[PDB]
Design a binder for these strands. Sequence first.
RNA 1: GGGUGAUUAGCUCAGCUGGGAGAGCACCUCCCUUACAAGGAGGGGGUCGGCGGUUCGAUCCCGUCAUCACCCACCA
RNA 2: GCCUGGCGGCCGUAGCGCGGUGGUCCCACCUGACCCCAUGCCGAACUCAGAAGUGAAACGCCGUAGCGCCGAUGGUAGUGUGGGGUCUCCCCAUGCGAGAGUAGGGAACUGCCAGGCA
RNA 3: CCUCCUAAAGAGUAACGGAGGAGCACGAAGGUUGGCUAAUCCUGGUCGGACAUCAGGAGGUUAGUGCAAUGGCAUAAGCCAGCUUGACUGCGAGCGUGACGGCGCGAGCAGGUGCGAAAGCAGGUCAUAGUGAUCCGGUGGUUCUGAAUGGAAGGGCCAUC
RNA 4: AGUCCGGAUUGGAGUCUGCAACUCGACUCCAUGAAGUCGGAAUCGCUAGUAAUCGUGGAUCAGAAUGCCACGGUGAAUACG
Lengths: 75, 50, 135, 177, 116, 39
Amino acid sequence: RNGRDSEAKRLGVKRFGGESVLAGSIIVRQRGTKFHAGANVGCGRDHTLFAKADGKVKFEVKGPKNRKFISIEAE
Amino acid sequence: GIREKIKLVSSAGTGHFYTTTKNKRTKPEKLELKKFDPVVRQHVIYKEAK
Amino acid sequence: MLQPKRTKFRKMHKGRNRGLAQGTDVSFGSFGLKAVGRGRLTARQIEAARRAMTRAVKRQGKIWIRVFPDKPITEKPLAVRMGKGKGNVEYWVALIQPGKVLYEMDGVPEELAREAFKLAAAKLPIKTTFVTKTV
Amino acid sequence: AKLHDYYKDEVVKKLMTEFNYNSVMQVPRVEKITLNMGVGEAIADKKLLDNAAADLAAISGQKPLITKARKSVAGFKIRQGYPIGCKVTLRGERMWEFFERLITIAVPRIRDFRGLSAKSFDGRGNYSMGVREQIIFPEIDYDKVDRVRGLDITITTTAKSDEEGRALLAAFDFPFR
Amino acid sequence: DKKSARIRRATRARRKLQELGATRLVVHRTPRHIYAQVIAPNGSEVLVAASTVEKAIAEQLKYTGNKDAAAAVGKAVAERALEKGIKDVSFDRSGFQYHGRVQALADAAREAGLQF
Amino acid sequence: EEITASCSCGNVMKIRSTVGHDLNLDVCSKCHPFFTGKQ
RNA sequence: GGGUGAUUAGCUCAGCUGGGAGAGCACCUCCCUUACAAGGAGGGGGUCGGCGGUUCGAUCCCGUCAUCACCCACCA
RNA sequence: GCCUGGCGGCCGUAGCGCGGUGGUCCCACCUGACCCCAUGCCGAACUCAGAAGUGAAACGCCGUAGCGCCGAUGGUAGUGUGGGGUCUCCCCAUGCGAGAGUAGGGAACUGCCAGGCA
RNA sequence: CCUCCUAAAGAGUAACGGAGGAGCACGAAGGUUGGCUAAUCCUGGUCGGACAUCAGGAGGUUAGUGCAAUGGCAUAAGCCAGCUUGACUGCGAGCGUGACGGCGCGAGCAGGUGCGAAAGCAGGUCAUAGUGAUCCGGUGGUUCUGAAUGGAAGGGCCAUC
RNA sequence: AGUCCGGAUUGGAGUCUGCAACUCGACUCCAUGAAGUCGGAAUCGCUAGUAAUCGUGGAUCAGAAUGCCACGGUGAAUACG
Ligand SMILES: [Mg+2]
Ligand SMILES: [Mg+2]
Ligand SMILES: [Mg+2]
Ligand SMILES: [Mg+2]
Ligand SMILES: [Mg+2]
Ligand SMILES: [Mg+2]
Ligand SMILES: [Mg+2]
Ligand SMILES: [Mg+2]
Ligand SMILES: [Mg+2]
Ligand SMILES: [Zn+2]
């Protein structure tokens, strides 16, 4: 009777560093803010980190508490 | 039905309601709410559940 | 008889015994009994070896057991079909990697410790050997 | 204002000559005085606390504040966030007025008085005490009693030691067995 | 504590306006020497400074650290910002209640022509 | 409101107290049997 | 092995959809009786088998352990 | 060139603790509280007008290794590919190389502006 | 249907594998502005007690997050008060995840509100469960149709049961 | 009204008795003021100066009575059966 599990929700990083992405592309589907919003990135209501402008994707590590930020470059 | 489904009829001359849920054992009073009404396209006070 | 008084869970996966051991230096007493083989020990084996050592030095001296089981073995009963859930627990075991110091003793002569450990080495499923205090 | 100025000259110079501090701000001064009344048996009588609040707003000048129950316990059969007790904080001019009308005209109407205790300090220089009767304040007409409701007093000061607070209060009467 | 308490009141806007990336009008209050700063969007480079510790507003004035001073402080900020070409800004209340001297300062800035 | 307390020790002492009435006392801090009580 | 119900004063039962332990017989102290039983008045007695726990809080809610009762254990 | 106040970059080699110093100016405590504002009671906070006292606390700097923190070299464990053995595990050839621990490093570094000082 | 492990560090991955929850709640528990920081222990303190309400110290998230678990939260997503209805409509560049039906995230536009002085925030709750296809019929609205024509009954569309 | 009712229990200071007052007393005073607001089921006496109430005297003894023996003051109700 013990065995049971949900359907897995397909989380994680959809687009990694070093990829030319377009606007509104979902990058990370996560639960908490394990990945933190930053430059050109919105945080969704399920903390889906979603993009705002065309360009690359750069994973910065900034902040006093050593957090993990995502950004969109231009060049 | 413990929490019961009701509506929010506009007090204007418009036949439109929104819809939401209320409880019996917490609210004896009817629900007054200001809300948009897309006939005159303004905000009208709503009442008269069900 | 050596058994966790309370555990976080009932059961545990089978797991593996790959690699070597940590508790290698003689760190409490003067003499040590160290595992050479690779396997698993029951609480009955540990208690019987303890009784053999305490028999040989009769009461006097201080004896350390550096190991403790904290791993159950589930055992399905006789005449039960496969599946239908993982079995119930009947005995607890300790994971043994080679080189693990098992027992330790202080307060006796060397030859007496040597013969007491060769009495208790026959109580055990593996080959064990004798070590001294080192640095 | 009176015992404030009495402090402001005599107790300042007295304590400074006692403990020979580096500066005057390092002397103990009284920081605040709080007053508590635990009304707990008003779990049923809701206006027991209302009249006890009127009693404390007659003792003090200012209107009191109720306290919320912090976490619910079945040891006292309370719900978390319950009307549970009433306090009054005092700072400044009303604080010195309350200390004046305490030590002059209330301590000697304590029932069968003998001097207060010594080890009643916190250890970091504060004081607290509890009463039994409550007509020890003059603002209570004797024909208005409805319970024997006491209360407790906390004098919170910046005394860096309880012995410094002891020597602070020895400049007052502060009965001292 | 007081200082860190004020900074954790202010960090809200002090990183939201960072993430917007716009020019910031920053204040510091003390009942002597109100201070006023106009800083580039990055946060490392100031542009326009006016404070009553400067003689040119210190000696022309009644008392260092009232709202009647802060009015002229922000007025001086507005002139020094318009002469450098900065008028469209955003405001940093710096963990202070927008009620007293900062309210007088920003209102006289708006009367002087600094339009956020 | 400020009132005037007066005890039997001759200690006429005006104080602020919310009695709203002038006051008659016996024992003050001056001339109370505290040290004689301890003795 | 497996599904169902039960452990409560000395004895026998209701109290389990969550916040004060009731009923009957027995026990004890008086009363009328030459003396008991029956009859009349008045009291206390449990820590709800036990181990752990959730929750503010458990006889009640949850997971095992000891005991009891019941039902199944078919095709062969 | 020094100190202080603010805004930052970096996020503990930057933080704890212990001892020492600082008040012309800057900072804080502070004085008073009718009105601005404010306390589910109190000028504790928030706010206001100020400047009598003060570096006590707090803040900044200096010194110090009792902890936190960084941390190599080498070796060990593991692992990709190929081969093998006494195949619950392990070895050989080759590429990759930890974590912990050891000697160590260490009381931060850099920029913008304003005021007082030489 | 949700959560962890088994899942071998992208996603996914079975079993009568090991462990738990949901078929609800809220007119504030939602939006905004301003603001605050908890558990536990020690000391002192009337009834007051191992533990109610007061004050201080250590400590510094062990506490809280409507609930099971995991992730996260100090710029608080935890707690207080005022003002409030954005739990508004019509759209959607683009993305994700499913064979499909579908499900979810969403900057931004037009109208029109609330909060803040402003920059700005708000298309429900910190998120991940809290659900039911179609058909058939109920109710309200209607620049639709109306079996010769004008109406009506019915049918559609929008909202909903 | 637990009241000026009620008097226990207790602290102190006494007196007199007697070798002797701790196991033990009798009384005065100062101060204290518990329960008790008419009594569950049951139960006792009493036909005239008694029922009830209020004093006193003796015997025991060196010292005590709310006990026993005796006397006096006031002084009832009901008996259809
Ligand atoms: Mg100092
Ligand atoms: Mg290493
Ligand atoms: Mg992988
Ligand atoms: Mg994965
Ligand atoms: Mg806020
Ligand atoms: Mg129709
Ligand atoms: Mg026709
Ligand atoms: Mg007769
Ligand atoms: Mg008699
Ligand atoms: Zn007097």
